Design a protein around this ligand. Structure first.
Ligand SMILES: Nc1ncnc2c1ncn2[C@@H]1O[C@H](COP(=O)(O)OP(=O)(O)O)[C@@H](O)[C@H]1O
Ligand SMILES: Nc1ncnc2c1ncn2[C@@H]1O[C@H](COP(=O)(O)OP(=O)(O)O)[C@@H](O)[C@H]1O
Lengths: 186, 300, 176, 62, 62
């Protein structure tokens, strides 16, 4: 598990504004605000030098293609793509993994995403965040904040793989039809 | 609570936020985005306009997000756009960030009868709630019937707020009886009032003075003096008691544009304890009894 | 997203049970109303009686009449108060029996006095409104900028009406 | 957003001791601060233990 | 063939609805795996039929 983790390995991000704009235009219609924001991120990253990653949400009704535009951004940026469902979840383990002690204990799905993508700069999609139930044994909202915190996430660790990992380049994408049920800190 | 000493973090004056951002935040964001002063330029007026319209709270995080967004947009305009170096003016701020977000935000600039401004020390800073009173039933319930003017109230009233409203109602009735006995408006009338939320329950009684002012204004119909604020607690006799969170209320008042305000004489030192630049453009009115406020609110 | 909801008001008791009767027209409400919605409707009915007395003292309809009102559910709680203007308009129309102007919609919060506070979610509301085939739309002056943020190809056929007080809303709805 | 966390971090740096923040807000399960009994499958200690382990020091800022 | 979809309990330590959704997900079905077997399997070509006397009680994500 640990060796499979891409250590210091980053996909060659696509840094050409014109081709990215054309790709996004031919991938979807409208979302001019979203296109402007993502291309602004591209421009700052180009200026910033080393690749970086911040977190944002696409909030709107369903059937809008939020996942579709996420895929379009992932392909245009040259970075890997992955999605995650969190609605109605109550086990923080799926984020923080298991203890690694019990035979066959699995790590958090973020570790699995890193293993699949083979890069430390993939694109991660979290969906129906507003639908979390955070019932008994859960309260993953705290885990979500830990994973998202721009300063702490650089040392994020799961229970399975106690060693921490940097998440300053990943691009987290959240989606929800409403901005109220979602927790205020998030 | 009693195991430690509680230190207050009031907030930041518009000038204070301006200085902090132009000394602490703006450089921090510029370093984060990798920009330089030559390429990335910001004037005092643009940031002041941002603070006044694009943002309004005791906190600063919103200003941080605004500055970050505009700086990122400038970085776009430089990397992609034709401007090697960006000069930022209120003219260009509309394109950079967009249209103004917050207007004066003052619900009423004339304060019709029965509605009165009041400062409340909310958890997230201060607030200027417009306590509003209303007649739920015509006073001519019966030309002879003198049925009690039962009052109504809304705004998620806790028990202590309910008692504050009742005591204020009784004291206002007595005050009107003494001053204008011929008037039965508050005597025979089914009245409703609202209290906006935000005030912490300990600070909620501070709105008793506002309540009595609004009730009297509704009773005799003269609107309260414009750009005037008040807040306090009454002990059934018109005696005005001290409160807390005075600095935050003063900050909100300043932001609210109110130029005249009344405070308890007990908290007079606390107000005087504030910085001079904070108390600029306002004329305070320290009181101990409600009677003075009447003339202050009703000089004519 | 957005939706259009027909707020309805019906008289559940004869207007004149007893001419000399002075009992209030107790209101009744539906729509799976959260408490805050209940205070919002309370405020709306207060301002409705106030405006009627200001403009039609001779009419006691809204005063001595027990009426029920249904607001269709589904709206997010944050946006539920935005029905205050609609509630006031429906109550007034029932009081004077004058049907509202056709293809005319509105949504907003009233401060118990007729002054309107801005509401969010304007864009999807307008989208549904157009999909509802409504021509004249009434909105707060404050939200005006948000409307102008929209692209032209959406706004066609929208006879917007930007207000801050209900008197303008009354006049627009009741041109007479 | 008035720098309470910021002033706490500044004090941590000034005193040369380490900085850590605990989010007790909206917290009722005392186990989170008292851990578990060590018997439950995958039991954990109180968050103070984790903070001390992370800081590697016995005089950090809390 | 899934029988009585509407009759799920979704209780403590149960919640098979998640397992159903992942199994039937048009993209995740291609790489489904379980606890005992730690290997993905494709299911795009498998045909799924479901039965339930009512539709309202069927969970929306399903
Ligand atoms: N402007 C658009 N351009 C292309 N496809 C769109 C557009 N809007 C919606 N769609 C389609 O709608 C589908 C809905 O995707 P979905 O995962 O439901 O996203 P959301 O959760 O935002 O509704 C997508 O497959 C997408 O192709
Ligand atoms: N006087 C100040 N100087 C610089 N930054 C400040 C100041 N006051 C607040 N901030 C900003 O507030 C943020 C941290 O505030 P925080 O400690 O979280 O306050 P609170 O605990 O009230 O939320 C920092 O990003 C910082 O830039």
């Amino acid at each position: 598990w640990l060796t499979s983790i891409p250590w210091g390995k980053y996909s060659n991000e696509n840094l050409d504004l014109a081709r990215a704009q054309a790709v996004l235009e031919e991938d979807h219609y409208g979302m001019e605000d979203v296109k402007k924001r993502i291309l602004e991120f591209i421009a700052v990253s180009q200026l910033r030098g080393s690749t970086q990653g911040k977190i944002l949400c696409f909030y709107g009704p369903p059937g809008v293609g939020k996942t579709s535009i996420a895929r379009s951004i992932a392909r245009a940026l040259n970075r890997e793509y992955f999605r995650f469902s969190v609605g109605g979840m109550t086990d923080v383990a799926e984020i923080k993994g298991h203890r690694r002690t019990y035979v066959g204990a699995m790590p958090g799905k973020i570790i699995q995403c890193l293993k699949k993508t083979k890069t430390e700069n993939p694109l991660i999609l979290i969906d129906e965040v507003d639908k979390i139930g955070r019932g008994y044994q859960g309260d993953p909202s705290s885990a979500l904040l830990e994973l998202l915190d721009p300063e702490q996430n650089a040392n994020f660790l799961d229970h399975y793989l106690d060693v921490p990992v940097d998440l300053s380049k990943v691009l987290f994408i959240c989606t929800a039809n409403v901005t109220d049920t979602i927790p205020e800190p998030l | 609570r009693d195991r430690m000493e509680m230190i207050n973090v009031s907030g930041y004056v518009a000038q204070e936020k301006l200085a902090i951002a132009e000394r602490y935040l703006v450089p921090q964001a510029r370093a984060l985005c990798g920009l330089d002063e030559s390429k990335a330029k910001l004037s005092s007026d643009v940031l002041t306009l941002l603070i006044k319209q694009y943002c309004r709270e005791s906190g600063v995080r919103n200003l941080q997000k605004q500055v970050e967004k505009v700086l990122r947009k400038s970085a776009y305009k430089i990397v992609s756009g034709e401007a090697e170096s960006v000069e930022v003016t209120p003219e260009n701020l509309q394109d950079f960030v967009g249209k103004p977000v917050f207007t004066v935000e003052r619900m009423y600039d004339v304060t019709p009868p029965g509605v009165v401004m009041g400062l409340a020390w909310t958890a997230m800073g201060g607030s200027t709630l417009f306590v509003e009173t209303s007649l739920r039933r015509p006073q001519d319930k019966d030309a002879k019937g003198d049925k009690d003017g039962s009052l109504e109230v809304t705004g998620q009233l806790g028990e202590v707020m309910k008692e504050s409203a009742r005591i204020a109602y009784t004291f206002a009735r007595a005050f009107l009886m003494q001053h204008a006995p011929a008037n039965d408006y508050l005597v025979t009338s089914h009245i409703h009032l609202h209290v906006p939320e935000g005030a912490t329950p300990k600070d909620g009684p501070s709105a008793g003075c506002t309540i009595v002012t609004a009730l009297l204004s509704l009773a005799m119909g003269r609107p309260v003096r414009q750009n005037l604020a008040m807040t306090g607690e009454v002990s059934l006799t018109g005696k005005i008691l001290p409160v807390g969170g005075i600095k935050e209320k003063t900050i909100a008042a300043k932001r609210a544009g109110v130029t005249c305000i009344v405070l308890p004489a007990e908290n007079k030192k606390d107000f005087y304890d504030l910085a001079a630049f904070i108390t600029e453009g306002l004329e305070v009115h320290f009181v101990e009894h409600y009677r003075e406020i009447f003339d202050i609110a009703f000089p004519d």
